Design a protein around this ligand. Structure first.
Ligand SMILES: *[C@@H]1O[C@H](CO)[C@@H](O[C@@H]2O[C@H](CO)[C@@H](O)[C@H](O)[C@H]2NC(C)=O)[C@H](O)[C@H]1NC(C)=O
Ligand SMILES: *S(=O)(=O)CCCCCCCCCCCC
Ligand SMILES: *S(=O)(=O)CCCCCCCCCCCC
Ligand SMILES: *[C@@H]1O[C@H](CO)[C@@H](O)[C@H](O)[C@H]1NC(C)=O
Ligand SMILES: [Ca+2]
Ligand SMILES: [Ca+2]
Length: 534
């Protein structure tokens, strides 16, 4: 029923979901299999003429989040579930996974020129797929707002498949493959979205957690040059939990350590050219080898095995330096956080219970930090349980004497204070920032990471006003205030500005606040950002 004629004259068919029209599973690149493994994506050559695109394709290979070189119950249990024939059926993955999805309001036609919202999924740069993020809620609300948009989602390679690093990858020019996947998708949107009814000049990119940091990397890509065929690939971006990535170069110490471990795991330890050896192992072997490197829920936690790393070519330097140096696209942006980002991640080191153990965990996590720096971090983030995350919970949630403390650090460095740093330096365009406390009172976790996905794609809640409405108005008019919410959203210029600069969300609704919390931690962490890089 629904139809579109692509740029190359190919005419495809979609699905009429009644409440929207969807074209799912459209291939945008040649399958990154065999010798194309770990390499930049290759534009899709082929004919889609006469093809129907009515279901999501498989996601790229996924990493066991509890994966690790050690052996334990959580790992064994997860692999059990993961390789189960039922899981493989309801949730299929493959190395051939580079597909793109387009979902629009019913009745949309070529030339409608609707604003486009390109979604980049999260998942710690190690798991993830586009199928788990329904556009229906965002789409329906846009229609009801008189501000219809087109939702575009793109599959990208995660884990070893898309973020392998080291000297060989570096020498080959194959760094950040997964980010290049997202980049190609953008180019595809620029070339073909008009046929679906969208306006290529009105693309807003957005993502959550790893997807959010990805948006940041796109702002920083090619020193800020975001053009394609003489025109920018996007007019704005929305960052849901996550700013710059605090990581060393692709051929740094941890990037190389991981590469070597994976190579040994695959049985390529003796190879002169480990990279070509890795291209030759079967998918199974490669999957096994990767699940034997640390996953993000394992003890290593947020000191990720796979993530974006500066390569000196597309991400030319330390990402914090690129922001201080002004090497970014000049676009209006929305960037926010959930109050307790680190509590889910803090559950990974619950065998750390004394300050002595905390000091060593931090020392293991941040190899570049000096003792004095570690001392400052531990003064700035005290053992006092009433000081940790879930914030403002007093003596509650004391899983261990160090849980709330570790959770406070991880969340701040990884997301919340990192956002403040960006905001205090970015002069590219108008800035709007939010902080959600929607789930205050939720035991153990508080307003934890990714809860915004629920209220954006699944359930309706006070937060949806921001996650759908406010985000829709921004994608359409470049100002969230066009949404007509009762609380006006103030522009953010600096964390030192007088007057409220944060949109805030609680269980009942919205209100405004100041982004002046935990200044001691901010300087402990950001006086010299590279001291805390992974
Ligand atoms: C908490 O558990 C972790 C994970 O098992 C311990 O770290 C492992 O310890 C073994 C034995 O010393 C090492 O061979 C592994 O390399 C460690 N794993 C990682 C991922 O580093 C850690 O020592 C425990 N911490 C405490 C304070 O008991
Ligand atoms: S992150 O780990 O990438 C996002 C994880 C979100 C998982 C939520 C788990 C919540 C457990 C309690 C649910 C109560 C309904
Ligand atoms: S999200 O997809 O739920 C989580 C994204 C994790 C990003 C981690 C980036 C590295 C953080 C380093 C500081 C903590 C050691
Ligand atoms: C990466 O950098 C090189 C050098 O600037 C450039 O030719 C190439 O087009 C960039 N790749 C992407 C995907 O932008
Ligand atoms: Ca090596
Ligand atoms: Ca500039």
């Amino acid at each position: 029923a629904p139809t579109a004629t692509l740029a190359n004259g190919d005419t495809i068919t979609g699905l009429n979901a009644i409440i929207n029209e969807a074209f799912l599973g459209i291939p945008f690149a040649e399958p990154p299999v065999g010798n194309l493994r770990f390499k930049d994506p290759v534009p899709y050559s082929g004919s889609l003429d006469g093809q129907k695109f009515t279901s999501y394709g498989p996601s790229c290979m996924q990493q066991n989040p509890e994966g690790t070189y050690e052996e334990n119950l959580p790992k064994a249990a997860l692999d059990l579930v993961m390789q189960s024939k039922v899981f493989e059926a309801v949730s299929p993955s493959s190395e051939d996974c580079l597909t793109i999805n387009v979902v629009r309001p019913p009745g949309t036609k070529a030339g409608a020129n609707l604003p486009v919202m390109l979604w980049i999924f999260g998942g710690g740069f190690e798991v993830g797929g586009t199928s788990t993020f329904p556009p229906a809620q965002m789409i329906t609300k846009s229609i009801a707002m008189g501000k219809p948009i087109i939702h575009v989602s793109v599959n990208y390679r995660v884990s070893s498949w898309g973020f392998l690093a080291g000297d060989e990858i570096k020498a080959e020019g194959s760094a950040n493959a997964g980010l290049k996947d997202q980049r190609l998708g953008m180019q595809w949107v620029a070339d073909n979205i008009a046929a679906f009814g969208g306006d290529p000049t009105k693309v807003t990119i957005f993502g959550e957690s790893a997807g959010s940091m990805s948006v940041m990397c796109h702002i920083l890509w090619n020193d800020g040059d975001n053009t394609y065929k003489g025109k920018p690939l996007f007019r704005a971006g929305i960052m849901q939990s996550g700013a710059m990535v605090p990581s060393d170069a692709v051929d740094g110490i941890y990037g190389n350590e991981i590469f070597d471990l994976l190579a040994s795991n695959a049985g390529c330890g003796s190879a002169s050219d480990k990279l070509a050896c890795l291209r030759g192992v079967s998918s199974d072997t490669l999957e096994d080898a990767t699940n034997n490197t640390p996953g993000f829920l394992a003890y290593s936690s947020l000191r990720l095995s796979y993530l974006p790393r500066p390569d000196g070519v597309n991400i030319t330097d330390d990402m914090y330096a690129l922001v201080r140096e002004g090497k970014y696209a000049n676009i209006p942006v929305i960037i926010g956080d959930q109050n307790d980002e680190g509590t889910f991640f803090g559950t990974s080191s619950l065998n750390v219970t004394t300050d002595a153990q905390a000091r060593e965990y931090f020392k293991q996590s941040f190899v570049h930090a000096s003792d004095a720096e570690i001392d400052t971090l531990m003064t700035a983030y005290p053992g006092d349980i009433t000081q940790g995350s879930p914030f403002d919970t007093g003596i509650l949630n004391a899983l261990t004497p160090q849980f709330k403390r570790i959770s406070a650090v991880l969340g701040d460095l990884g997301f919340t204070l990192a956002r403040r740093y960006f905001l205090n330096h970015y002069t590219g365009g108008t800035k709007y920032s939010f902080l959600s406390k929607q789930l205050s009172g939720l035991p153990v976790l508080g307003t934890f990471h990714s809860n915004d996905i629920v209220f954006q794609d699944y359930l309706l809640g006070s937060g949806s006003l921001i996650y759908n409405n406010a985000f829709i108005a921004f994608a359409t008019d470049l100002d969230p205030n066009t949404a007509g919410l009762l609380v006006k959203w103030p522009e953010y210029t600096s964390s030192s500005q007088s007057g409220n600069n944060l949109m805030m969300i609680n269980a009942l609704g919205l209100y405004t606040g100041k982004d002046n919390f935990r200044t001691a931690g901010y300087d402990a962490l950001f006086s010299n950002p590279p001291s805390f890089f992974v």
